[PDB]
C-alpha cells in the first residue's frame, strides 16, 4: 500500500478524478534518504494524467488520494512501486521509496 | 529528349555539372608562388630576439618540420593524407615555375643564366628548410605501395633535383649515408617491381568492349606517368656524373644489406622489350595499324626512352 | 558548477565536459555527420538567396555579409530531446533520447559567460577563474562551439560573437578583441575550430547560392530552347537549315544539348552558340561576382584577410609545439587561398530536390542517421534489430528508387557495407542479410549502381566463406548481381578474381561441411552445397545476354583443367567415376534414409546438384556456332577439350534414367517429394543445354534415337499428369517448364532435319499425339502454349502427309 | 631435430648457429676449406651431432665429440677461404663419407602443410646442399645468450622449488640444494633495466628508435618463450600463501626474500607485456589467472599494473570482460580504499579505440552507481 502524511493544510474538498491533467512539485528519496528526484532543479511542474498509468500505480493513488493545494509526503512500497526491476544506475533492486508532492493547479 | 520538357530538378541538377565541367574547372587561379613567398616571410623572428637563430622556425620551415615528423612516427603503414598531397602539389608548383619558363626569339645564354638563378633560388627556398629529407622520408615510409602520396613525393622531388644541383644531391648522399637505413632502397625496388608494361589480352577486351557499345587508356599500360616519374627522379640523382651516387646505389656501403638498382632496371627493360616483342608479333599480321596501337606503342616507346636515358646517366660518367 | 568562479580548474573543466557529454554529445554529432551534404529544396526561399547583400546602404557593391549570418535552406533534421523522468513507469524497444536541458536560457548564459570572461582577460589579474587563463577560456570556448555548431545561436548572437572575436572587422556600418590577446595554445586552438564553423558557413552559403542561381537560370534556358523551337519547326522554307539546326541543337541528350548550350565561354564559341547576349551576359555577370565572392581578383576587411594574417603573425610570433595545433591552423590557411577548390570539390555532395518531396527527404536523412551513428558502437542484438528495421524504412521509402543519383552521392553503398565487413569480422546472420538483400536491390535499381558496386568485387571475395555463401543472401550473391547481365562488367572481369573463386571451388572439395559433421552427417569428402554457390557465380561470369564471353569461358575451363580437383571426386583421375556411377550412387543413397539422414541437408541431392551445375557451367563456356564455322583454331581446341572431358554416353543415359511421378493413392494424393533429395528435371534441362551447346544434333537416326529414349517418356507422363487432380501437383508445373525450356525449342531446331524418316511413322504420330496434348494443356503460361503450338506448326512444316 | 622453416622464423632468434673451429689459438681468426669445426646452437646450447638413430641431431656438450660433432665445409660434393656472404658450400661430417641433406620432400608433410624438411645425414646426398651464410645484429646475438642463460637459470630455481614442493621442511633444510635466490633477484633486475621504456625527454626519432629496439627485443623473449617461464615462477610462488608458509617449507633465510621476489616477477612480466599489442593479446586465456590474484595482498600494484597494461592494449579482453570480473575489480575500490587506477581501470573497460562496449557500461553502472557509496 501507499501511505499518505499531510506536511501543509490544502484547499480541500479538490481531488481529480479520472480524466485530468495534473502539475506537481515532487521530491523523491530512498528509504534511506538519498535523493533521486527533485522538480525543483528542473524548474518545471511534472504534468501527468490519471487513468493512461503512465505513472507507476503507488503514485496514482497517492495524487488521487489528496486534495489541491496540500503538500503531502507518500510512502510507496516496492510492491506498488518497480521493485525488483528498479532503474538501472538510480534505484536498487529491492527499496521503498518516499515522495513528498505538492499538487497544484488542478485542470 | 528536348530540354523543355524536363522537370525543373533534373535541369537544374544538369546545368550545375554542365557548369562545374566547363567555367570553374577551367578557370586558372596562381596562389602557389605568393602563398610560398608569404609563408617563407620570417616576420620578426630574427629582431624580437636575437639570442639563437631560428628560435622560431620560418612558417615553411614549421610545416616542413611536421611533415618530416608525421614520416618518421612509427606505423604500421602509410595512410592518404590530403593535407600533405595539396601541400606537396603548392610547393612543387612554386619550385617548379622557372624550370617550366613560368619559332622562338633569340635569348641570350646570359638570359638562361638569370633564369638558372631564379630556379636555384626558388629550388633553395625549400631545400635549406628540410624538403630535401622529407622527401626521402616519404618513400622510405610509403614501404613500396603505389599511391597518391608517392606519386606526390616523387613531383616534389623531382621538382627540386631539376637540373641535377650538387647542393640537394649532396644533402640526400649525407642524409643516406648518415641514418644507414635499407627501407629507402627496398621501397624503391618494390615501386619498380610493381611497374606496368603492355598488355594485349586487355587490349583486345577493350577492343571487343569498346566496339560492342558497352575506350580508356586504364586497360594498357597505367601508370606511365608514376613509372615516368620514377626513373627521371632516378635519373636526376645521378645527374651531372657524380661517382658518388652511381656507386652508392650500386653497392649500399655500411648498410646490412644492398639492391641492385642497377640491375632492377635492366629486369624491367627485358620485362618491357618483351611486351613490345609480343605486340610486335600480334600487329605483324595487320596491314595497317589501328590508332590505339599506334597510341599504345607510343607510350610504351616513350617508356622505353626513359629508361635508356637512367642508364646511360648511371655509366656516363666513366 | 558553470557560474562558480572559485572552482578548482580539473572540476571546473570536468563539470563542463559532463554537462556536453550528457546533454549535447549524440546531437551534436550527428548534425556533424549530416553537415556534409548539401541537399537544397526548390523553394521560392531558395530562390531568394543572393550570392553578395543588396546596396541597403545606396551605391555599395561587392561588401561582403557577415560570416554566419543569412538564411540556410540546405535541409538538415532536427534534434530529439526526452524529458528527464524517473517517476513513469519502466516498460525491439524505441532508442531513448537525450536529456532535456533549456536550451534557449543555455545559450544566453553561455554567451554572457563568455562576454565577462573577455573582459576580465582584457582587464589583467592575478587570480583568473579557474586557475589560468587557459582554465578560464577553453571550456567556454568549447561549449560555446558546441551550440554554435548545434545551431542554437541565433543571427544576433553570431553578430554579437562576431564582435567578441573581433570588433573592428565584423562591425555593422576600447573594447580589445580575442584574437589581439595573448593566449596559450589550447585557447588558440579552441578558436581555430571557432573559425572553421564560419568558413564552412561561407562555403555553403556559395553552394546555395550557386543553387538558387541555377534554378533562376534554368526556366530562362527553357523558355529561350521553346521559342527557338518554336521558330525552327515552322521553318519549312529552308529546310537544309532548319534540319541542320535541328540536328545541331535538338535531336539529341539532355546532358549534350546543356553542355552545348553552355559552351560559350570563349569569344569564337559565343558565335557557336545560339543564346542570346543577354542570357550570355547574365552567365557572364554571375560568374564574375562569383569569382569576386571567392576572392579571385594593413586592416584586415573579410575573414580570409583576418585568418592568414592571424595564422601567420601566430607562426611568427611563436614557434608552436603541438602537432594537432600546427595542423589546424595550416589546414586553415590552405582553405583561404584555394577558396575556389574547396567550390569544386563540394560540388559533387551538392544536390537539388522538389519543394514536393522535402518531408520524404528529411525522413530518408533520418534513417540514414541511425545507420551512420551505430558504425561507433560494438554490434549486438538491440543495434542489429535497429538496423534491420531502419534498412526496411530504407527500401520501402519513395526517394531511395526515384533518386538513385542522390543514393549515391549519399553512399549508404560503402556506409552498408563496412556494416557487413564489421559483422563478418557467423554471428548476426539476419543482420548479414539484410545488408546482402539491401546490396542486391541497389545493384538492381540502375546499372550506375551496379558499376559503382563492381569496384569492390574482388574484396567481397576475400570476405566470402563457405559458411557465408551458404547463408540464404551471401557478399557472393551480391556480387553475382553486380555482375549480371553486364557485358561491360562481364569483360571487364579480372583473371585473378576467377583464379580466387576457382580456388575456393578446389578447396570446398576437399573435405566435409563443418555444419553438417557438427550436426552429424557422414563425412563424405567435399562439400557439394560449397560448390553450388561457385559454380552459380561462374555461370553468372561466362553467361550474359544468351551468348558465352569467349574470353571468360576459355579462362575458367583453362583453370578448370589446370586443377581438376574443381571436378569433385568422380570426373577426377583414375579413381572418377562416370556420371552414370555417380547419379546411380545418388539414387541408392536417397532410396536409403539413414545414409541421407544425420533430414534437411539433403545431401543425396546435394551430389548431383553439383554435378548438374557443373555441367550446366560447361555448356555456358563452350564456344559459339559461328565461330565453330569460321574454324576459329582456339575455339575448336575449347570445344575438343570439353569434349574430351564429358562423353556423350553419360549425358544420354543420365537423360534417359527417370525421376519419381506422384499419382493418387488411397487417400486420394499420394507423396511428391520434391527438392529432398529427389531428381528434378531442371538438371536434365541443364544436360539439355550442355548436349545443344556441344554433341550437336546433326543425324536424323541418332535425333529420333535420343528423342524417343530420353524425351517420349516425360511427355507421356506430362500428358497423363495433365488432368486437373494430377496438374495441380506441384512438379507438373517443373516438367512443363523443362520441357518448353529445354525439349521443345531442339525440336523447333532440328525440324528441317525430321524431313525423310524411314519407317518412323507410328512414333511420329505417337509423339505428334503427345505434342498437340501438351499444346492443348492446361494450367499452363500463355508463353509455354505458345511455343508448344510453334513447335507444331514448324515440325508438320517438314513431315509428309 | 632440425627441419626447414618459414614467416618471422627468419626474424627468429632460434635459427641462430654459433661456429667453433676445433683450434684454440686465433679460432675466430679465419677459417679454412675442409676445416673440421663444430657447429653450437646460440638459444639452446646444442651441438650439431651425427648418431646411428638419426641423420642430424644436437647434442648436450658432455655427449659432443670429435667423432659426432666435428663437421667441415666442402663444394660440389668433393671428397679431396669461404665467404660470410654471396658463396654456397657442401657440409661433411668429419670421419664420416655422410654428407648434410634433407629428407625426400615428404607428401605427409606436405599434408600437414608444415615445411619441415627433416634433415639425414647420407652420402649420397642432393643438388640443394649448398647453403648460404648470413650474419646476425650484435643486439640478437646478445639476446640469445642472455634467453639461454635465463632459461637455464629459471629452470633450475622452479626445480629447487619442486623439491621441496610438496614436504614440508619443519626443522631440517630440504634435501635439494638451495635455490639461487640471489642469482634469481640480481637477473630480475638486470632484465627489468633491459626491458625500460624510452624517456618521454628523447627527441621523437631517437625514441621512436628505441621503441622498435624494445619491441623487437620483447618479441624475441616472448616467442623463445621467457613469458610461459616467468608465469609458471610466479604460480609455483603463489601456490604458498604467505612468506611463513615458504619458510615452513624452503627455510627463513630462503623465505627472506619471497616478497621481493614475487613483486620482481610481477614488475618483469609488465615490463615484457607493456606496449606490445601481440604480447597483451596472449592473455585472453589468462583473464582469470590475472584476476584471481588482484586479492593477495604481495605486489597489490604489481598485478593492478599488469592488468592496466593488458587491458589498454588488447581490444579482444574486453569482449571477454564479465559480470563476475567486473564484481572483482570494484572489490578492489571495496576492500583496499579509494584509488584513482582502479577508476582508470573501469574507464579503459568501457570503451576502447572509438568503439563502446555497451554490456561492459551498463555492468559497471548497474554495479557501481546504484549503491551511492
Given at each position: 500500500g501507499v501511505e499518505i502524511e499531510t506536511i501543509s493544510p490544502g484547499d480541500g474538498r479538490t481531488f481529480p478524478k479520472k480524466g485530468q491533467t495534473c502539475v506537481v512539485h515532487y521530491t523523491g528519496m530512498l528509504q534511506?534518504?538519498?535523493?533521486?528526484?527533485?522538480?525543483r532543479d528542473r524548474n518545471k511542474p511534472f504534468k501527468f494524467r490519471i487513468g493512461?498509468?503512465?505513472?507507476?500505480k503507488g503514485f496514482e493513488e497517492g495524487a488521487a488520494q489528496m486534495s489541491l493545494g496540500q503538500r503531502a509526503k507518500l510512502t510507496c512500497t516496492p510492491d506498488v512501486?518497480?521493485?525488483?526491476?528498479?532503474?538501472?544506475?538510480?534505484?536498487?533492486?529491492?527499496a521503498t521509496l518516499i515522495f513528498d508532492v505538492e499538487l497544484l493547479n488542478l485542470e | 529528349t528536348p530540354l523543355y520538357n524536363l522537370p525543373t530538378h533534373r535541369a537544374c541538377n544538369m546545368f550545375l555539372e554542365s557548369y562545374k565541367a566547363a567555367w570553374i574547372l577551367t578557370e586558372d587561379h596562381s596562389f602557389e608562388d605568393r602563398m610560398i613567398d608569404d609563408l617563407s616571410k620570417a616576420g620578426e623572428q630574427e629582431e624580437e630576439?636575437?639570442?639563437?637563430?631560428?628560435?622560431?622556425?620560418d612558417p615553411l620551415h614549421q610545416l616542413v618540420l611536421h611533415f618530416s615528423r608525421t614520416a618518421l612516427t612509427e606505423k604500421s603503414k602509410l595512410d592518404e593524407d590530403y593535407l600533405y598531397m595539396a601541400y606537396a602539389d603548392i610547393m612543387a608548383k612554386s619550385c617548379h615555375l622557372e624550370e617550366g619558363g613560368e619559332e622562338e626569339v633569340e635569348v641570350s645564354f646570359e638570359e638562361k643564366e638569370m633564369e638558372k638563378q631564379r630556379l636555384l633560388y626558388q629550388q633553395s627556398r625549400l631545400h635549406t628548410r628540410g624538403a630535401a629529407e622529407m622527401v626521402l622520408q616519404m618513400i622510405s615510409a610509403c614501404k613500396g605501395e603505389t599511391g597518391a602520396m608517392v606519386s606526390s613525393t616523387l613531383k616534389l622531388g623531382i621538382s627540386i633535383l631539376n637540373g641535377g644541383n650538387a647542393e640537394v644531391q649532396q644533402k640526400m648522399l649525407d642524409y643516406l649515408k648518415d641514418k644507414k637505413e635499407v627501407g629507402f632502397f627496398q621501397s624503391i625496388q618494390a615501386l619498380m617491381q610493381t611497374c606496368s608494361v603492355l598488355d594485349l589480352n586487355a587490349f583486345e577486351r577493350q577492343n571487343k568492349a569498346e566496339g560492342l557499345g558497352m575506350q580508356n587508356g586504364?586497360?594498357?599500360?597505367?601508370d606511365d606517368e608514376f613509372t615516368q616519374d620514377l626513373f627521371r627522379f632516378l635519373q636526376l640523382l645521378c645527374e651531372g656524373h657524380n661517382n658518388d651516387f652511381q656507386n652508392y646505389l650500386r653497392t649500399q656501403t655500411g648498410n646490412t644489406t644492398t639492391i641492385n638498382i642497377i640491375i632492377c632496371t635492366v629486369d624491367y627493360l627485358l620485362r618491357l622489350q618483351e611486351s613490345i616483342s609480343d605486340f610486335y608479333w600480334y600487329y605483324s599480321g595487320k596491314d595497317v595499324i589501328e590508332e590505339q596501337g599506334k597510341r599504345n606503342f607510343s607510350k610504351a616507346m616513350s617508356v622505353a626512352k626513359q629508361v635508356f636515358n637512367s642508364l646511360t646517366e648511371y655509366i656516363q660518367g666513366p | 558548477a558553470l557560474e562558480d568562479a572559485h572552482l578548482p580548474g580539473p572540476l571546473r573543466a570536468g563539470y563542463y565536459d559532463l554537462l556536453i557529454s550528457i546533454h549535447l554529445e549524440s546531437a551534436c554529432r550527428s548534425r556533424r555527420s549530416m553537415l556534409s551534404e548539401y541537399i537544397v529544396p526548390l523553394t521560392p526561399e531558395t530562390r531568394a538567396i543572393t550570392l553578395f547583400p543588396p546596396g541597403r546602404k545606396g551605391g555599395n557593391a561587392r561588401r561582403h555579409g557577415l560570416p554566419g549570418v543569412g538564411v540556410t535552406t540546405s535541409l538538415r533534421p532536427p534534434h530529439h530531446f526526452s524529458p528527464p523522468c524517473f517517476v513513469a513507469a519502466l516498460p525491439e524497444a524505441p532508442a531513448r533520447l537525450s536529456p532535456a536541458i533549456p536550451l534557449e536560457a543555455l545559450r544566453d548564459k553561455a554567451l554572457r559567460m563568455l562576454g565577462e570572461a573577455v573582459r576580465d582577460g582584457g582587464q589583467h589579474?592575478?587570480?583568473?577563474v579557474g586557475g589560468s587563463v587557459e582554465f578560464q577560456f577553453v571550456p567556454v570556448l568549447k561549449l560555446v562551439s558546441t551550440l554554435l555548431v548545434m545551431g542554437i545561436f541565433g543571427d544576433e548572437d553570431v553578430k554579437q560573437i562576431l564582435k567578441m572575436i573581433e570588433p573592428e572587422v565584423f562591425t555593422e556600418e576600447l573594447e580589445e578583441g580575442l584574437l589581439q590577446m595573448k593566449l596559450p595554445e589550447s585557447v588558440k586552438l579552441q578558436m581555430c575550430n571557432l573559425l572553421e564553423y564560419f568558413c564552412d558557413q561561407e562555403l555553403q552559403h556559395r553552394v546555395e547560392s550557386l543553387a538558387a542561381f541555377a534554378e533562376r537560370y534554368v526556366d530562362k534556358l527553357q523558355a529561350n530552347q521553346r521559342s527557338r523551337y518554336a521558330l525552327l519547326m515552322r521553318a519549312f522554307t529552308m529546310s537544309a537549315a532548319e534540319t541542320a539546326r535541328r540536328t545541331r541543337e535538338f535531336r539529341s541528350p539532355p546532358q549534350e544539348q546543356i553542355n552545348m548550350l553552355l559552351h560559350f565561354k570563349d569569344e569564337a564559341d559565343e558565335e557557336d552558340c545560339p543564346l542570346p547576349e543577354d542570357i550570355r551576359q547574365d552567365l557572364q555577370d554571375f560568374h564574375q561576382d562569383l569569382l569576386a565572392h571567392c576572392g579571385i581578383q594593413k586592416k584586415p576587411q573579410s575573414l580570409q584577410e583576418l585568418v592568414s594574417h592571424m595564422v601567420v603573425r601566430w607562426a611568427q610570433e611563436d614557434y608552436v609545439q603541438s602537432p594537432e595545433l600546427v595542423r589546424a591552423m595550416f589546414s586553415l590557411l590552405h582553405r583561404q587561398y584555394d577558396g575556389l577548390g574547396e567550390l569544386l570539390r563540394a560540388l559533387p555532395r551538392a544536390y537539388t530536390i522538389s519543394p514536393s518531396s522535402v518531408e520524404d527527404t528529411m525522413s530518408l536523412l533520418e534513417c540514414l542517421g541511425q545507420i551512420r551513428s551505430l558504425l561507433i558502437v560494438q554490434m549486438g542484438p538491440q543495434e542489429e534489430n535497429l538496423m534491420i528495421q531502419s534498412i526496411g524504412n530504407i527500401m520501402n521509402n519513395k526517394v531511395f528508387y526515384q533518386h538513385p543519383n542522390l543514393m549515391r552521392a549519399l553512399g549508404m553503398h560503402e556506409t552498408v557495407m563496412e556494416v557487413m565487413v564489421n559483422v563478418l569480422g557467423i554471428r548476426f546472420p539476419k543482420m548479414v542479410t539484410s545488408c546482402c538483400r539491401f546490396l542486391c536491390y541497389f545493384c538492381r535499381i540502375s546499372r550506375q549502381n551496379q558499376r559503382s558496386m563492381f569496384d569492390h568485387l574482388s574484396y567481397l571475395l576475400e570476405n566470402s566463406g563457405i559458411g557465408l555463401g551458404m547463408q540464404g543472401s551471401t557478399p557472393l550473391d551480391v556480387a553475382a548481381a553486380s555482375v549480371i547481365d553486364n557485358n561491360e562488367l562481364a569483360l571487364a572481369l579480372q583473371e585473378q578474381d576467377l583464379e580466387k573463386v576457382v580456388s575456393y571451388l578446389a578447396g570446398c572439395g576437399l573435405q566435409s561441411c563443418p555444419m553438417l559433421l557438427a550436426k552429424g552427417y557422414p563425412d563424405i569428402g567435399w562439400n557439394p552445397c560449397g560448390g553450388e554457390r561457385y559454380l552459380d557465380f561462374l555461370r553468372f561470369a561466362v553467361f550474359v545476354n544468351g551468348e558465352s564471353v569467349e574470353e571468360n569461358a576459355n579462362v575458367v575451363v583453362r583453370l578448370l583443367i589446370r586443377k581438376p580437383?574443381?571436378?569433385?571426386?568422380?570426373?577426377?583421375?583414375?579413381?572418377g567415376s562416370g556420371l552414370l556411377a555417380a547419379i546411380e550412387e545418388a539414387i541408392r543413397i536417397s532410396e536409403d534414409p539413414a545414409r541421407d539422414?544425420?533430414?534437411?541437408?539433403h545431401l543425396g541431392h546435394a551430389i548431383m546438384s553439383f554435378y548438374a551445375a557443373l555441367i550446366d557451367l560447361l555448356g555456358r563456356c563452350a564456344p559459339e556456332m559461328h565461330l565453330i564455322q569460321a574454324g576459329k583454331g582456339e575455339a575448336l581446341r575449347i570445344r575438343a577439350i570439353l569434349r574430351s572431358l564429358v562423353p556423350l554416353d553419360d549425358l544420354v543415359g543420365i537423360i534417359s534414367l527417370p525421376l519419381q511421378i506422384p499419382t493418387l493413392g488411397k487417400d486420394g494424393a499420394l507423396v511428391q517429394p520434391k527438392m529432398s533429395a529427389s531428381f528434378v528435371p531442371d538438371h536434365k534441362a541443364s544436360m539439355v543445354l550442355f548436349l545443344d551447346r556441344?554433341?550437336?544434333?546433326?543425324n536424323q537416326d541418332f535425333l529420333l534415337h535420343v528423342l524417343d529414349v530420353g524425351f517420349l517418356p516425360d511427355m507421356r507422363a506430362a500428358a497423363s499428369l495433365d488432368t486437373a487432380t494430377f496438374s495441380t501437383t506441384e512438379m507438373a508445373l517443373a516438367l512443363n517448364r523443362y520441357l518448353c525450356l529445354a525439349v521443345l525449342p531442339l525440336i523447333t531446331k532440328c525440324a528441317p532435319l525430321?524431313?525423310?524418316?524411314?519407317?518412323?511413322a507410328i512414333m511420329v504420330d505417337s509423339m505428334l499425339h503427345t505434342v498437340y496434348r501438351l499444346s492443348r494443356?492446361?494450367?499452363?503460361?500463355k508463353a509455354q502454349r505458345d511455343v508448344i503450338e510453334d513447335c507444331l506448326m514448324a515440325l508438320c512444316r517438314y513431315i509428309r502427309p | 631435430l632440425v627441419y626447414y622453416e618459414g614467416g618471422a622464423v627468419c626474424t627468429h632468434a632460434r635459427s641462430l648457429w654459433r661456429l667453433e673451429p676445433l683450434?684454440?689459438?686465433?679460432?675466430?681468426?679465419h677459417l679454412r676449406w675442409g676445416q673440421p669445426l663444430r657447429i653450437r646452437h646460440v638459444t639452446t646450447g646444442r651441438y650439431l651431432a651425427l648418431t646411428e638413430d638419426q641423420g642430424l641431431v644436437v647434442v648436450d656438450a658432455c655427449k659432443a665429440?670429435?667423432?659426432?660433432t666435428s663437421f667441415c665445409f666442402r663444394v660440389s660434393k668433393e671428397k679431396l677461404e669461404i665467404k660470410y656472404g654471396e658463396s654456397l658450400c657442401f657440409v661433411q661430417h668429419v670421419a664420416s663419407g655422410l654428407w648434410l641433406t634433407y629428407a625426400a620432400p615428404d607428401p605427409k608433410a606436405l599434408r600437414l602443410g608444415?615445411?619441415?624438411?627433416?634433415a639425414i645425414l647420407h652420402?649420397?646426398?642432393?643438388?640443394?646442399?649448398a647453403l648460404f651464410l648470413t650474419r646476425c645484429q650484435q643486439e640478437e646475438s646478445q639476446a640469445a645468450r642472455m634467453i639461454h642463460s635465463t632459461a637455464g637459470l629459471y629452470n633450475q630455481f622452479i626445480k629447487g622449488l619442486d623439491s621441496f614442493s610438496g614436504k614440508p621442511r619443519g626443522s631440517g633444510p630440504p634435501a635439494?640444494?638451495?635455490?639461487p635466490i640471489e642469482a634469481v633477484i640480481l637477473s630480475l633486475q638486470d632484465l627489468i633495466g633491459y626491458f625500460e621504456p624510452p624517456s618521454e625527454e628523447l627527441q621523437h626519432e631517437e625514441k621512436q628508435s628505441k621503441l622498435r629496439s624494445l619491441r623487437n627485443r620483447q618479441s624475441l623473449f616472448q616467442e623463445e618463450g621467457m613469458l610461459s617461464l616467468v608465469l609458471n615462477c610466479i604460480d609455483r610462488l603463489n601456490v604458498y600463501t604467505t612468506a611463513a608458509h615458504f619458510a615452513e617449507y624452503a627455510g627463513e633465510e630462503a623465505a627472506e626474500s619471497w616478497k621481493e621476489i614475487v613483486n620482481l616477477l610481477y614488475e618483469l612480466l609488465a615490463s615484457l607485456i607493456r606496449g606490445n599489442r601481440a604480447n597483451c593479446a596472449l592473455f585472453s586465456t589468462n583473464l582469470d589467472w590475472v584476476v584471481s590474484?588482484?586479492?593477495?595482498?604481495?605486489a597489490s600494484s604489481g598485478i593492478l599494473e599488469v592488468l592496466y597494461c593488458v587491458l589498454i592494449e588488447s581490444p579482444e579482453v574486453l569482449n571477454i570482460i564479465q559480470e563476475n570480473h567486473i564484481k572483482s575489480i570494484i572489490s578492489l575500490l571495496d576492500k583496499?580504499?579509494?584509488?584513482?587506477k582502479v577508476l582508470d581501470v573501469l574507464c579503459s573497460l568501457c570503451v576502447c579505440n572509438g568503439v563502446a562496449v555497451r554490456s561492459n557500461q551498463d555492468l559497471i553502472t548497474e554495479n557501481l552507481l546504484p549503491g551511492r557509496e
Open positions: 534511506n534518504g538519498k535523493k533521486f528526484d527533485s522538480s493512461k498509468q503512465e505513472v507507476i512501486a518497480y521493485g525488483a526491476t528498479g532503474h538501472p544506475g538510480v534505484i536498487p533492486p529491492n | 630576439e636575437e639570442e639563437v637563430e631560428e628560435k622560431k622556425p586504364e586497360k594498357v599500360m597505367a | 589579474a592575478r587570480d583568473p580437383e574443381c571436378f569433385g571426386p568422380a570426373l577426377r583421375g583414375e579413381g539422414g544425420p533430414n534437411r541437408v556441344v554433341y550437336g544434333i546433326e525430321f524431313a525423310g524418316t524411314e519407317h518412323r494443356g492446361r494450367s499452363l503460361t | 683450434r684454440i689459438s686465433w679460432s675466430g681468426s665429440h670429435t667423432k659426432a608444415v615445411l619441415k624438411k627433416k652420402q649420397e646426398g642432393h643438388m640443394d646442399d635439494g640444494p638451495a635455490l590474484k588482484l586479492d593477495r595482498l604481495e583496499h580504499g579509494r584509488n584513482h
